[PDB]
Design a protein around this ligand. Sequence first.
Ligand SMILES: O=C[C@H](O)[C@H](O)[C@H](O)CO
Lengths: 204, 197
Amino acid sequence: TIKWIDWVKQIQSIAQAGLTYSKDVYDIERFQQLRDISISMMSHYTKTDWEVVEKLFASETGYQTPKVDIRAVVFQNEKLLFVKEKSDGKWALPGGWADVGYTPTEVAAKEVFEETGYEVDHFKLLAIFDKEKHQPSPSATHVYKIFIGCEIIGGEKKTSIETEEVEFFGENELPNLSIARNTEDQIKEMFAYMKDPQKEKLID
Amino acid sequence: TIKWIDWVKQIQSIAQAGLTYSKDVYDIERFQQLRDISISMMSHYTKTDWEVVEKLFASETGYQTPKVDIRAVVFQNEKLLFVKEKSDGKWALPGGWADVGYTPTEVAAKEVFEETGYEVDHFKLLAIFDKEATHVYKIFIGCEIIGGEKKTSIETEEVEFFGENELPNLSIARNTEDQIKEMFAYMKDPQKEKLID
Ligand SMILES: O=C[C@H](O)[C@H](O)[C@H](O)CO
């Protein structure tokens, strides 16, 4: 693996904590210098514009925790609901970044409605995966993925600008997965839950 | 001209100054973390440059989400592990902010070890709460003592196990009275539906 990336992510994290919590004017200035070195290291070794890296890597406030992604797990006739993005042509469970000001089930409901047309409720906590644990490639960011089971209670299948196709798929007919949005192993775990819904919940 | 070497040397020299001159216990710990990382970095890549990773930011947008707090839920014969906090002198489950570089269960095991000296395993996902300027998803993770011993701290003045009717004064930001009640409900009925806000 690339060892340097996880070191630099930890330096930015501590610098971000220092800028939030230090009250010492010379320590605040040391934490700002350290964040700026972290941007410069990322900028040079990924050949990415310095100011772009600052926005993508080093503009959060407060203590730095992993980011939260939500995936909705909706079955019908033992087939799992997937949505295809028009631009990249790849498939994933409905979901996305958790919006500030929304609870996890509100994110699941809103993402399912916007991407698929369906109304959902009857939320179940299924799993929390650590995106980095067996990640294919190195990442600038650390993500926890919360999988929430839901029941379709209304609305109707509807495509959009972003969302070209909405379809259910059986476990021996999976479409081309967006590995960034969901791994094969995360999908296999959801079919294991469908077969035995009283099973232990996966937490990385 | 191998640029990582001068940047790591700068990080080291800043961290050493911070470590020498800070009077705040939390500032000292941050500078100690940075010193520790810089040592680890220098002890690698002897001759070579760092690998260029030109695709690292391809799908990155700088989107901000709720922060993650983790609370470890540790029972011993029907009593729940609490910790008296230096901040307010009130009591809470071991836990805190989830750190970059750690899985949820590594966070739970780490917070329990540093705050109480116990080593835990057998992790179970119990709940995620959020009652909606700071937005927080709080993950309750159950686990069991497999080793270590009870050790109080400069940070953690007392470590006590408490039953449902003898609860100490709770640090309410860290754990509400309803969140603790729910945890006792999981211990008593261990097939209760897991809560997710
Ligand atoms: O919240 C957790 C943090 O470690 C502490 O609040 C910081 O060290 C700031 O003092």
